[PDB]
Every structure is written in structure tokens, then in C-alpha cells.
Amino acid sequence: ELERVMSSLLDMGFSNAHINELLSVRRGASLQQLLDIISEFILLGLNPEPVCVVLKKSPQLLKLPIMQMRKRSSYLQKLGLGEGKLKRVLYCCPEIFTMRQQDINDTVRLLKEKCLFTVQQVTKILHSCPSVLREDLGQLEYKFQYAYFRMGIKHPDIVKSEYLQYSLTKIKQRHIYLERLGRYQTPDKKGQTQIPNPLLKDILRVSEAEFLARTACTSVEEFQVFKKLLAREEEESE
Amino acid sequence: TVIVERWWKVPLAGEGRKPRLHRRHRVYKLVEDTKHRPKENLELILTQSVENVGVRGDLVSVKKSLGRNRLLPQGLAVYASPENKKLFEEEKLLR
Amino acid sequence: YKKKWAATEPKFPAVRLALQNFDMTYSVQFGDLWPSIRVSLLSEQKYGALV
Amino acid sequence: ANFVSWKSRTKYTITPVKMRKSGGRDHTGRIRVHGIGGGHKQRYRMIDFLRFRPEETKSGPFEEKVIQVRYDPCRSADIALVAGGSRKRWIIATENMQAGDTILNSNHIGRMAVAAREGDAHPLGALPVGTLINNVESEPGRGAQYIRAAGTCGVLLRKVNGTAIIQLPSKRQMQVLETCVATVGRVSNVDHNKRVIGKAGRNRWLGKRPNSGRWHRKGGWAGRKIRPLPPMKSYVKLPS
Amino acid sequence: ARGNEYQPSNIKRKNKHGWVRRLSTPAGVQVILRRMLKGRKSLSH
RNA sequence: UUAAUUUAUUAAUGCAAACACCUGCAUUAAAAAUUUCGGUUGGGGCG
RNA sequence: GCCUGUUUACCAAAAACAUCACCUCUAGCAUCACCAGUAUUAGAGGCACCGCCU
RNA sequence: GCUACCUAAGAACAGCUAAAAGAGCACACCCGUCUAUGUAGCAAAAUAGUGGGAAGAUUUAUAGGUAGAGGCGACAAACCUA
Ligand SMILES: [Mg+2]
Ligand SMILES: [Mg+2]
Ligand SMILES: [Mg+2]
Ligand SMILES: [Mg+2]
Ligand SMILES: [Mg+2]
Ligand SMILES: [Mg+2]
Ligand SMILES: [Mg+2]
Ligand SMILES: [Mg+2]
Ligand SMILES: [Mg+2]
Ligand SMILES: [Mg+2]
């Protein structure tokens, strides 16, 4: 009943303002369902006002079956996504609760088995950039292997720089440019290079201006021409 | 049921003799698995009123699962054998 | 013939060998223009049309 | 092999039980776990992990007197012989449990939070949020399975509805019905980490033996390797 | 150093190669049957 | 082993099949299994 | 090479193997090993007592 | 029934020095460093001397277990009846 739900929401840290906001947000959702969903979200360690913000942004969450919501919440806790970690995840990609359990499981299994990311590294990836879950398999594996083999990056650095966050097209556009320019060299079998390579923050994190001014030391027009040429090369390769 | 077929043809045995099989005649290819066939329906004659199917004495095509799990075990239906059809025909004409 | 040797050379492909030769020579020859020349060489070639 | 598990006793008892070592072998006689063998002969003291076990023809919260706190060869945590009514049982002693102390075991989920005194067992619903706990059950009445090693302490992170969120010593959250019992405080023998084995012989006393060939797969141990994709085969191991 | 691999003990002898152990398994029963077919005076050890 | 050929078997998934368990069929792995080591030339090479 | 130990029974006893110590990875769990154990736990790998600077 | 490891329940370890020791010297015991002898030998791995450990991760009797692509292995490709 509304009495019980109001008492519970007075508990759990929710203030009357947010309670009224959520009650209005109810899109024909039963008070029982709303109470259960908020209960699961705060069980996941999420604060009351972020819960309110998330339900505002994505009311569909209230429509999720309680069984499925509980299963997904338990899975996220097992993956380590909880407490403050789940906040930025629910903002960057609020659809993790809607994704199929199989999609999440296979993404994590690709990250662990076929990519040899530690459990902590996997949690860090899913915490910093949940867009990986949206990104399809195969493409993700290609991106990781591009970082590992062709670029010579190791898992700690990949995770530290959030390399998986960036798009494969951008990654190739910058790295191949550097490589052909000779400013980047794939580490040899010994893992050494004639010249130290530029850092991934200098390669991908920075904007095109600084990227071409400090790391490549070339001209923007040259970079545009190279980008078009590389696009043609990829088209032909396919 | 899994239905299989020899890769290698077996030479004819004769009339009263039995075919002699060899190592190569134990190699099979699966021609079909019946469990993947499209589901067919079971013909039943109802005995008691049942929702959304019928009342009594009317031949009905019901999903085999329903027919074998609910109707027949509970006596709500009987097999559409010629004998049952005849008996329910006399029942109908006696009304 | 001596089948077993203490160490064998890396067995580079000819393309990489040419790249290494060019890197060690044209880099000195051209200074700061060598990266541009290198990327141009490694990229596609611009073809003119002679009627 | 003619291996029958020694864990055949059916009736709980205080007497230490003569336990047969396994050597890391299955009932088949083959090594299943490596590095196990030898060590000092040990006797097993049946530990009652169901702290709220009201005596026969009895019910409701009950108290118990700590007869003694003893070293257990089969655990990191030290145990306590504790007696109540007309029975005695072994439990896991908490950090400051002393002989002669009184311990309370209750199944009452009071509306208010019960004053959490180290050593007593209450349903998780009855504890203040943030209290240190150990010997936690996964289900009501299942029996303690988590937070049992020496010096370990989970935290009652949250309580909502009939569900409590606990932080296990591995810093992983766990959901348990608030009706499930747990005992307050951290497990005894908190200095277990700081113990220095000192010599290989001491591990051999503890029944750990140096053992090789721990994998039995062709080629032995093989760390996982990332199989390159066709595009990356060209750069897997670039010669210097 | 070598040669004395046989350290006799009637308990091990009977427990390892005795009639009861031979009959304990179909393989051992076939061992006995082969000895019988060959006509061995000593079927078991 | 990034030699060739397989995945029977397990582990995952997916699709059917029975309304957790199990059968069939696929895919990916793990584990393995089978098999091969062309010829002529070249002692201080890198064919 | 920290140490005492182990090893090629029958050409090698060693600097090799193990070893306390330390690091990394994996695992939130009961009725046949691990274990009648539960993250200060268990399994695996690496390294090498320890101590001082970068 | 050897050997590798393990299980059950046994046993042995003088004397001195030191004090509760993977402690020292050193018997029994275990091993096998070095040398010589022997090399169809006493011996299909021994003898003599020399030497290492010798209250321990020790040695050892008894019975049981693990079986061949398997076991077991303080990894020597060691051992699993010369
Ligand atoms: Mg013997
Ligand atoms: Mg040494
Ligand atoms: Mg030798
Ligand atoms: Mg020896
Ligand atoms: Mg020697
Ligand atoms: Mg003495
Ligand atoms: Mg000594
Ligand atoms: Mg050994
Ligand atoms: Mg070796
Ligand atoms: Mg070798």
C-alpha cells in the first residue's frame, strides 16, 4: 500500500521531494514494483538522489521484472559493479539492466579468456567505459589485439589509458599515421624499440591539434589526406 | 528419433542370408532427427466440457502435449479410435 | 655444410629490409622531411593521366 | 581404492575425533590436490557452526558460559568449548572471548537494534548497520560458512526489507535474508597473519609438502597465451 | 645393489596373487580360466 | 608449435526438444588425437 | 647458493631442486580430495632468507 | 614384496657439549664426497679407507593405495621388479 511504500521511502534515505518526484515518474508502475526496484538499486549501494536521477533518465527500469532485476543486480555485484562504481555506469550506459545476461557474460568472457584481463582490470574497464558492453564482440577483440600486438601495449597500460573507450577508426587513423611517419615503432620480440614511443595519452586522449603538433609534428591537411587514404584502404581491404 | 544412413552401400546378402557388415558400414550420416520435425496434432474425442476446446463428443485436434498431459490422463478426453467414434455417434443419435 | 649455428639473423622480409635501409640513410639525408617522405612512400601513390 | 571417508560419525560430540589424513588423494587413490601429506597427527573437534541451536525440548534465546578457549589444529581460528543448559559444544571463539564469559544466542529480530556485544549471535536484522560480524550463514538455519578464518570480520553494510548486504573479508558484497544469524566481532587469533613459519620443517609439520608435477596435463603448467588474429599474425613477435 | 627385489611376505603374496583376489574380478577369473585351460598345476599364488 | 587434418570427448553459449535435468544440431574454446619432415647443392653461413 | 634438506638406484650431489620470506593470478563455497575447511582460507605460478638505497 | 609418493598404526636415535634447537662434535643408523682396489668382480654397482647427516623436511619394520600416455616425481626425463 501507499502507506507502507511511503514509510519505506521515508526510510532508506529518500527525502519527500525525491519521493514525490519518483511517484510522479511512475508510468503506471505499481507502488510495489517501484519499492522493489528502488530497494534493489540501494542494495547495489546506490545513493537515493542518484537513484532518483537514474529513474528520471530511464523510466523503463521501473518496468523490468523484479526477478530479472534481482538476477542482474546479483550479477553486477559479482562483477564488482556496486556502491559508487555503479553510478557513472548507470549514467554513461543506463541500459546495462536491460542488456541480455548472455551479452554481458560473453563480453566479460571475451575480456577474460580471449583477452587475458584480470578480474580487477575487467571491473575497471566496465566502470570507466561501459560502452564496451554495447560494442560487439569480434570488433572488441580486434581493438584489443590491435593494442596488444600491432601497438605493443600491455593490459595495465590499456586499462590505465581506457584505450578500449576510443573508436577503432580513430585508433587506427592516429596509430598508422604515427607508424608510417616513423614516430611510432612496434616493440620487437624483446619488447624494446630504437626510440621510445609516444604515450597513449599523447596519442588518443589529446585533440587533433596537439596530436599533430607535438606527437606527429605534421600539418592538419596532411592528416586529413592520410585519413581519407586510410579510409579507402579499409574499404578496399573489406 | 535419430535416423541415420550408411555412407557406404552394403552389398546385397541374398534371400535367406544375412548381410555381412564391415568397418566401413559402421559409418553413418544423420538423415534426420525426428524431434526437430514440425509438431503435429492429436485427434481426441472429448468427454467433459473443457474451456476453449469443446464440450463433449466433438473430435478435436489438440496439441500432443495438452492431449497427453491434461486431457487423456484426467479422463477429459478419449482417443479418437473407430470404436470411440462409433460409441459417441450412437450417443449423439440417441439425443 | 654446418647445419647448426649459434645464432641466425632475424630473417626480415625484403620490404622491411628496404624500410630499415631507408630509415638509416634518408633520415640523415633529409632531417625533418624524412617522416613526411616516409609516410608519403608508405601511403598510396598519386597517379597522373597522360592523354 | 578401498578409501572410505573418516567423516562417518553421525552424532555430535565434544571428544576430539581421530581424523585420517588424505595426502591429497581422492577415494580413487590418485592425487587430486598436490602439496598435502604428512604433518602432525591431529584430532578433529566437531564445531557447531549453528550458533542458535536451542537445546532439545527448548526454544528461544539462550545464554552459554565459555568453559574455555582452546587452540584448534584444524583451523586458523581458535575455538571455545561453551556450555549451556545441560550440553556443551565447540564454537569459533571471537577476538576477546575469555573463559568464564557469557554468550547470548538469540533468534529475536527486535524492532530496535540490539546492543551488539562481542561474541553473541543475533539475526542480522537485529544488528546495527556497520557492525563487525563473523560466522555468517548464507540461508536462515543453514549454519555459518563465511567469515570463519582467524581475525576475519565482515561488515553489515546495509539492511533493507528482509535482506541485508554484508561485506565479506574479500571485500565482496553478499545478500542474506535478515533472519539469518551471525555473531558479532572479529574471529579470534587475529595475529595469524604475523606468524612466521621460519623453516621448511614447520610447514612439513603443518602437513604441507613440497610437490611437483602439479598439473598432469601434457607439457605441465602452461600460462594462458593470447592467440593472435589473422591480421595480427604479422606482428605477433617482430624480430629485432 | 639390485637383484633382491623380492622381499617375501605371505600376506602380500596372498593379497596380491591369491585365489580370492583372482576371482574378485572378471579379468582375474579369466586368468584362472587360462591357467586351467593350459593345465597349470598351480592356478593361483 | 602461428606444420596439416579433426572436435569424437568435455566447457561454454545459441537454436530446436521435453516443461532443474536431459536429447539433437550448430559455433567458439579447452584439452587432446592422427600424421609429415621433398630433392640437388653450400665447411667459417644468414642461401 | 641464504641456511638444514633433495636429486640423475648403476659415471654428475652441484651453482640444479626444495626452502622459510615476498609478489602475482583464480575462487563467496559444504557432505568422498580441497574440507567435515570458508579470503588471516584454498588452489596455481613466479621469486628467493634477510636488510639498505633508486 | 624394488622404487616414487601417500594412508594407518608402530619402532630407533650412545656419549659429550649445550638447553626445548630442521643446534655443535660424535656412536648405532642413514647416505655415498674423494681415493685406491675390483671390472665374467665377493658384487649385473662391491670392498677398504676417507667423508656428509645423525631429535629430524630423520631413519626404519608391518599392512594398504596410486598402473602405463597412466601413476608418482623437493624436475634428475627420476622412478614404476636389475
Ligand atoms: Mg621393503
Ligand atoms: Mg645450498
Ligand atoms: Mg649416479
Ligand atoms: Mg639417493
Ligand atoms: Mg657421485
Ligand atoms: Mg643423542
Ligand atoms: Mg643437528
Ligand atoms: Mg624425493
Ligand atoms: Mg632440468
Ligand atoms: Mg635434460
Q: In sequence order, what DSSP letters do the residues of A56-91 get, joined into one string?
A: HH-GGGGGS-HHHHHHHHHHHHHHT--TTHHHHHHH
C8 closest-nt by C1' vs CA: F46
Measured distance CA(A3)–CA(D159) in Å, rounded: 20
Distance D130 CA to G31 C1' (A): 34
Of D7, D83, D1, whose CA–CA distance to D48 is shortest? D83
Are residue D2 and residue D76 in the same domain, yes or no?
Answer: yes
Inside any domain, residue D144? yes
* B72: nearest Cα among B35, B52, B42: B42
Contact B19, B26 (CB under 8 A): no
Chain D contact for C12, CB < 8 A?
yes
In whole angstroms, give the CA distance from residue E25 to residue E28.
5
For strand F, is any atom closer than 7 Å to the CB of C4? no
Q: How many independent structural domains does chain A possess?
A: 1
Asked if the Cβ–Cβ distance from A187 to D231 is below 8 Å, we say: no
- Three-state secondary structure call for residue B42: strand
What positions of strand G are covered by protein, i.e. any atom < 7 Å from a CB? 3-4, 9-10, 17-21, 24-34, 36-46
User: Residue D33: which CATH number?
Assistant: 2.40.50.140
Which residues form the domain of D55?
1-106
- Count up the domains in chain D and report the number: 2
CB contact at 8 A, A173 and A187: no
Q: Among the three residues D58, D75, D106, which one is the final residue of a domain in this structure?
A: D106
Q: State which nucleotides on strand F lie below 7 Å from a protein beta carbon.
A: 1-2, 12-14, 16-19, 23-25, 29-33, 42-47
D47 and D146 together in one domain: no
R_g of chain E, CA atoms, integer Å = 13
Cβ burial, residue A150 (10 Å; 0-12/13-18/19+)? buried
Residue of chain C with shortest Cα separation from A188: C10
Residue A183 is classified by DSSP as S
- Determine the protein residue whose CA lies at the shortest distance from the C1' of G5: D200
H helix or E strand, kind and range, residue D44: strand D43-44
Residue D127 domain-assigned (yes or no): yes
Report yes or no on D212 lying in a domain.
no
Tell whether D54 and D111 lie within a shared domain.
Answer: no
Q: Domain check: are D71 and D122 in the same one?
A: no
Q: How far is the CA of D196 from the centre of ligand 6 (A)?
A: 29
The Å distance, CA of D16 to C1' of G6, is 36
3-state secondary structure of D82: strand
Residue D86 within any structural domain of the chain: yes
Range of the domain at A174: 1-238
For residue D194, what is the DSSP state? T
Q: Which of A50, A49, A85, A55 is nearest to A69 (CA)?
A: A55
Instruction: Strand G proximity: list residues 156-195 of D with CB under 7 Å.
Output: 168-170, 172, 174, 186, 189-193, 195
Q: Which domains does chain E have, with CATH numbers?
A: 3-45 (1.10.287.3980)
Rounded to whole angstroms, the Cα distance separating D174 from D56 reads 32
**Terminus-to-terminus CA distance in chain A, angstroms?**
60
Q: Which of A183, A232, A233 lies at the smallest CB-CB distance from C35?
A: A183
| Strand G contact at CB of residue D151, distance < 7 A | yes
Q: Give residues 13-42 of chain D lying near strand F (Cβ < 7 A).
A: none
- Residue of chain C minimizing CA distance to D239: C10
Q: 3-state DSSP call for residue D237?
A: coil
In angstroms, how far is H45 C1' from C6 CA?
39
All residues at 6 or more sequence positions from B28 whose CB lies less than 8 Å from its CB, including other chains: B4, B5, B6, B7
H or E element in which residue B87 lies: helix B82-93
Grid coordinates given for D102: 557469557
Resolution limit in angstroms? 2.5
Closest residue by Cα to residue A223 from D46, C35, D120: C35
Residue A191 CA from chain centroid, whole number: 29
DSSP string over A15-50: -HHHHHHHHHH-SS--HHHHHHHHHHHHHTT--HHH
